[PDB]
Design a protein around this ligand. Structure first.
Ligand SMILES: Nc1ncnc2c1ncn2[C@@H]1O[C@H](COP(=O)(O)OP(=O)(O)O)[C@@H](O)[C@H]1O
Ligand SMILES: Nc1ncnc2c1ncn2[C@@H]1O[C@H](COP(=O)(O)OP(=O)(O)O)[C@@H](O)[C@H]1O
Ligand SMILES: Nc1ncnc2c1ncn2[C@@H]1O[C@H](COP(=O)(O)OP(=O)(O)O)[C@@H](O)[C@H]1O
Ligand SMILES: Nc1ncnc2c1ncn2[C@@H]1O[C@H](COP(=O)(O)OP(=O)(O)O)[C@@H](O)[C@H]1O
Ligand code: BEF
Ligand code: BEF
Ligand code: BEF
Lengths: 531, 536, 24
């Protein structure tokens, strides 16, 4: 059995469900002495997996009253009358045993909007509950609770004062609010002395009620896997960091990123850009008390508008595997649709899912295909395409609450972006990445290879002072052409060297075919701003 | 019956499902006094054809427990009710006789997302399955195993911890995975011990395991139709041709002639194609020894008629990698909203091949550099440009997919796609002059009858500034008049070869398809970066 | 020039389910 001590997370909403189903039954001389009759049961809603069916289990053991279980589509029959007869015989069953509680699981299956549906027998079932909960005289002491995850597809004639009083929203826990959910889901397990659960709460963001129960389930399976080579065990953080790799996406399963990683040392030259990008993410998550002390919202919008080839789209791969936040990827126009509704609702279901798994960082690559707003109808660009822009304008800031979502934009043309997005509040940190100079060209080659023998006795400063005006991607072509001729000198008959000792002879022909991508006329369009 | 021996071909995803079902049954003494319940729901996802529904039949006869089978649309029925009662009558049957596993199939069809479909019963089947797996003190002895090829179509409240936890991916086996498939479906067949199967594992790449069963079944029908005894490699070599795996069934490329002998003179361009598409496929250990990414695909530009899409056919029938052909602007659609998925599904099937090459000829209709810079036509179709920019390099990891492009001028191509990492090779094929004009006449006359020795140097002396297609119709008109005397064979043509007969009337018509003013646009680039810039 | 921005689904009449009233 479970109790109120076995349920954590929300606490202010725990008391509003205990003062309603236990307090009228244990303390009955406060309602008849002063005030109106006590309220009836409530409808629990929210995202799936927050402890909304376990909440109705603790009131079935600690209260001691009569409990009857009713599922949504369990009450079905091919007959005409028995679709609603089993609901009617159950409500009078709990009326005979006063008091009693009734749990209706998944009530949205048997209570949609009546004006939207047409030509069914379920409209007899949803009109049966209007005269069964609060009918003529059939309501004395019984209370009916329910747990659902979709309150929008419920008719408004079921949520008035007689039937369902309050809409309790068991939401996502916060800092020092998701520590107690892990402790009581690990109490019966044997642990060692080196575990630290306060360190786990800062690295579990979207883990709400069951992913935090799956983190302790996957780490326990890893201890059994290493024990297959009677006996007691003990978990010692070697498998919590292993189970933290893939245990988050209960809501964000559609937008999982795998498995690119650069580990924050494959990038070079951008010393000031790495410290500016990390501080906009590390500050609002690791130090939440410093922002509420000043009472100001942090900076969230980052946009890259450099020329193509300087390292700008895989720079978001650096923040995808280093910082402790969920990553959502939008690869260009990968979410538009020709249905007139899903063109802008694809913007809608991503952002609130990102708002559910707070904090997180989304990535909008190639915004030139998304932020085309001021041209229409311009011949071939097509009309009715500004609705995906106006939906994007209402999700960056919009009319919502500050949920600490971070938007990273990557584009190669800053003049084709909508200027309504180019404002603080939506995208404030506009940082331009230039071509690496001769002082940044020494830190660009050692970060590219990172695992190859560099022929000890050689110097790489000659490439730094030469090949001026080259982007970061062109210098990857030079180190790939030298490796192209390095394996060309090793595919012959070995009956030569069983060592990857790449010398300067491979870099001699690599500098010959190395060409410049960004032209001199194209470079003047980025330097014309001088902001 | 199948078992744990016939399920081979995978080790990483096989051990995850063996310790999920059998290990709590064969060893329950350590799962007690440990505080955690064993996982109860297994759902696998991936490409269709990898045997996601076979593995449930293999673990059914190995654990020795009660097994139940539930199809997708077998539960759905009219007379409202019994679409939910048939799901209830099957879980209570598996509730007794502990332990009892139960296999539900086709979760992509039934129980979809609620707010994305319009079905009256579909709001009730997706929620009855919820309370049957985690309701009020349920999930005692049942173990639900599911198999779906579309995980994004199911309800998001179904892949949670209580119902379907600890997801597994059943993908395409390529890193030494194809060889174990061939050793399972051939131990029951008779095979002549004269060939090895180690070199046959690296022949095809886009196979899903069921196509490997199709390769051994193609050689079985070829063996019995040539003996109208075992099997030999010549029947399996016929199975390599017209292969067409299920991942690349929409695109067919196997309709062209043989190659590697029709081209000639361009030795520095043909050998550059060998050092790009054969290096990461034949020697994968040399790239992991250095730990660097291999070179990407090529791009062809120059005069039209020089041999820029026949060389793309040279990598279509010679190399062991697959091919996907896109005939220019074939992936463009009239609808505004689609307009990227044909670019996506080509590259989605390309990353599932591992490896393959694609061909995008006529890049002037594909690139369309910048819609902001062009206002005189009013195009501004930057949606398909930015989609191709995020698919070749993109966000996800690279899986050795090479892109080959053929055009004529690079001035109308975007500089964002001309950078290395997406299209790094910017080679320009030149016009033949006194060195490549003699080897082409022996390459394009390889399977043709010739007379006793005639010099071909004088044909190269007269033709100046001629393209590769311009050297066609010089010898093609020779074969046109070589069949004129065959009509006069009526009352046997007594010459089974081609004598001269043509250059008094065909060589005098020096046709030039490329003008002198049009050739000046190609000889204007001259990449300004030179050699001799090493260290000292 | 003009590209259609919508498919505009306007059909689909769903399933039905009967209510078999017993006879005696
Ligand atoms: N502190 C907690 N409070 C509630 N449920 C918890 C808690 N810790 C773990 N859980 C688990 O999270 C799940 C949430 O249960 P519930 O919300 O009632 O189910 P559902 O999401 O199916 O409606 C249950 O499996 C429960 O055991
Ligand atoms: N020092 C470097 N810093 C960052 N990226 C680098 C560096 N050297 C090479 N690169 C490569 O350059 C590319 C930069 O990606 P990105 O700038 O996002 O793309 P693009 O500029 O083409 O839009 C990546 O492939 C990355 O690996
Ligand atoms: N390597 C392999 N491992 C397991 N089954 C294989 C393999 N190669 C072929 N098969 C067989 O191919 C069939 C495909 O099974 P399955 O992946 O469930 O099919 P599908 O996903 O197309 O419905 C099964 O009969 C399976 O035994
Ligand atoms: N040696 C050759 N190399 C390449 N193409 C050749 C050669 N001889 C003839 N051709 C002709 O060139 C064409 C293919 O070359 P390619 O430049 O790819 O064509 P396209 O004109 O479509 O760009 C075919 O018509 C083929 O018959
Ligand atoms: F447990 Be159910 F999702 F109310
Ligand atoms: F929300 Be504002 F009108 F962009
Ligand atoms: F057919 Be080619 F690419 F002009």
């Amino acid at each position: 059995e479970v109790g109120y001590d076995d349920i954590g997370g929300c606490r202010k909403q725990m008391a509003q469900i205990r003062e309603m189903v236990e307090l009228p039954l244990r303390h009955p001389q406060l309602f008849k002495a002063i005030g109106i009759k006590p309220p009836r049961g409530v409808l629990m809603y929210g995202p799936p997996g927050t402890g909304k069916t376990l909440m109705a289990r603790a009131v079935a053991n600690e209260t001691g009253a009569f409990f009857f279980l009713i599922n949504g589509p369990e009450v079905m029959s091919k007959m005409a009358g028995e679709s609603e007869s089993n609901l009617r015989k159950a409500f009078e069953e709990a009326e005979k045993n006063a008091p009693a509680i009734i749990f209706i699981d998944e009530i949205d299956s048997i209570a949609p909007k009546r004006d939207k549906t047409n030509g069914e027998v379920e409209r007899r079932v949803v009109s049966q509950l209007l005269t069964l909960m609060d009918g003529m005289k059939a309501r004395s002491n019984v209370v009916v609770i329910a747990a659902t995850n979709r309150p929008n597809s419920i008719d408004p004639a079921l949520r008035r004062f007689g039937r369902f009083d309050r809409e309790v929203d068991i939401g996502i826990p916060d800092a020092t609010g998701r520590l107690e959910v892990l402790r009581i889901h690990t109490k019966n397990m044997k642990l060692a002395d080196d575990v630290d659960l306060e360190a786990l709460a800062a690295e579990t963001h979207g883990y709400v009620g069951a992913d935090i129960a799956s983190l302790c389930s996957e780490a326990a399976m890893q201890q059994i896997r290493e024990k297959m080579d009677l006996d007691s065990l003990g978990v010692t953080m070697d498998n919590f960091r292993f189970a933290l790799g893939n245990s988050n996406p209960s809501a964000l399963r559609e937008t999982v990123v795998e498995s690119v990683n650069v580990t924050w040392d494959d990038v070079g030259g951008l010393d000031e850009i790495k410290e500016e990008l990390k501080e906009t993410v590390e500050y609002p998550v690791l130090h939440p008390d410093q922002y509420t002390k000043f009472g100001l919202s942090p900076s969230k919008g980052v946009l890259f508008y450099g020329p193509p080839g300087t390292g700008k789209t895989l720079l978001a791969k650096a923040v995808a595997t280093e910082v402790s936040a969920n990553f959502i990827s939008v690869k260009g126009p990968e979410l538009l649709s020709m249905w007139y509704g899903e063109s802008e609702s694809n913007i809608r279901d991503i952002f609130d899912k990102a708002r559910a798994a707070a904090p997180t960082v989304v990535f909008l690559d190639e915004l030139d295909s998304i932020a085309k707003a001021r041209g229409g109808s311009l011949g071939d660009a097509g009309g009715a395409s500004d609705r995906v822009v106006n939906q994007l304008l209402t999700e960056m800031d919009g009319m919502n609450a500050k949920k600490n979502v971070f938007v990273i934009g990557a584009t190669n043309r800053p003049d084709q972006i909508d200027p309504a997005i180019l404002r603080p509040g939506r995208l404030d940190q506009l940082i331009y990445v230039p071509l690496p100079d001769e002082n940044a060209r020494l830190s660009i080659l050692n970060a590219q290879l990172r695992k190859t023998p560099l022929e000890p006795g050689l110097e790489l400063t000659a490439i730094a002072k030469a090949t001026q005006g080259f982007s970061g991607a062109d210098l990857l072509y030079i180190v790939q052409r030298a490796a192209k001729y390095a394996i060309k000198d090793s595919i012959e008959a070995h009956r030569v060297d069983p060592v990857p000792y790449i010398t300067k002879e491979h870099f001699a022909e690599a500098m010959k075919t190395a060409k410049r991508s960004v032209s001199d006329a194209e470079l003047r369009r980025y330097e014309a701003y001088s902001q | 019956e199948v078992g744990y021996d016939d399920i081979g071909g995978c080790r990483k995803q096989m051990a995850q499902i063996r310790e999920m079902v059998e290990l709590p049954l064969r060893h329950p003494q350590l799962f007690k006094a440990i505080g955690i319940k064993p996982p109860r729901g297994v759902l696998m996802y991936g490409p269709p054809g990898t045997g996601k529904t076979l593995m449930a039949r293999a673990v059914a006869n190995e654990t020795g427990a009660f097994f139940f089978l539930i199809n997708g649309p077998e539960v759905m029925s009219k007379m409202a009710g019994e679409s939910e009662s048939n799901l209830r009558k099957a879980f209570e049957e598996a509730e007794k006789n502990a332990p009892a596993i139960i296999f539900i199939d086709e979760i992509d069809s039934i129980a979809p997302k609620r707010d994305k479909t319009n079905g009256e019963v579909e709001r009730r089947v997706v929620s009855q399955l919820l309370t049957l797996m985690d309701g009020m003190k349920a999930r005692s002895n049942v173990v639900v195993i599911a198999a779906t090829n579309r995980p994004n179509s199911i309800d998001p409240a179904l892949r949670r911890f209580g119902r379907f936890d600890r997801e597994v991916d059943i993908g395409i086996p390529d890193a030494t995975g194809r060889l174990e498939v061939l050793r399972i479906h051939t131990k029951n067949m008779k095979l002549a011990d004269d060939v090895d199967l180690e070199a046959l594992a690296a022949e095809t790449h886009g196979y899903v395991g069921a196509d490997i069963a199709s390769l051994c079944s193609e050689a079985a029908m070829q063996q019995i139709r040539e003996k109208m005894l075992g099997v030999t490699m010549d029947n399996f070599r016929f199975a390599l041709g017209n292969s067409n795996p299920s991942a690349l069934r929409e695109t067919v490329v196997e309709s062209v002639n043989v190659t590697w002998d029709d081209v000639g003179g361009l030795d520095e361009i043909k050998e550059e194609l060998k050092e790009t598409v054969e290096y990461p496929v034949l020697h994968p250990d040399q790239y992991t020894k250095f730990g660097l990414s291999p070179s990407k695909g090529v791009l062809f530009y120059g005069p039209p008629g020089t041999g820029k899409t026949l060389l793309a056919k040279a990598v279509a029938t010679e190399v062991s990698a697959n091919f996907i052909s896109v005939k220019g602007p074939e992936l463009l659609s009239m609808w505004y909203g689609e307009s990227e998925s044909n670019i996506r599904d080509i590259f989605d099937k390309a990353r599932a091949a591992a490896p393959t090459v694609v061909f995008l000829d006529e890049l002037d209709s594909i690139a369309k550099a910048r819609g902001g810079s062009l206002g005189d036509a009013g195009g501004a179709s930057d949606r398909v440009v930015n989609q191709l920019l995020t698919e070749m390099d993109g966000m996800n990891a690279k899986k050795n997919v090479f892109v080959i492009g053929a055009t004529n001028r690079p001035d109308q191509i975007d500089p964002a796609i001309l950078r290395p990492g997406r299209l790094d090779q910017l080679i320009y094929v030149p016009l033949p002059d006194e060195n490549a004009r003699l080897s082409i006449l022996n390459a394009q006359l390889r399977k043709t009858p010739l007379e006793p020795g005639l010099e071909l140097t004088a044909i190269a002396k007269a033709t100046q500034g001629f393209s590769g297609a311009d050297l066609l119709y010089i010898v093609q008109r020779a074969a046109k008049y070589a069949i004129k005397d065959s009509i006069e064979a009526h009352r046997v043509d007594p010459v089974p070869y081609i004598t001269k007969e043509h250059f008094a009337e065909a060589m005098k018509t020096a046709k030039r398809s490329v003008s002198d003013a049009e050739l000046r646009r190609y000889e204007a680039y001259s990449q300004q970066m030179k050699a001799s810039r090493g260290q000292f | 020039a003009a590209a259609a921005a919508a498919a505009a689904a306007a059909a689909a009449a769903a399933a039905a389910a009967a209510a078999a009233a017993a006879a005696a």
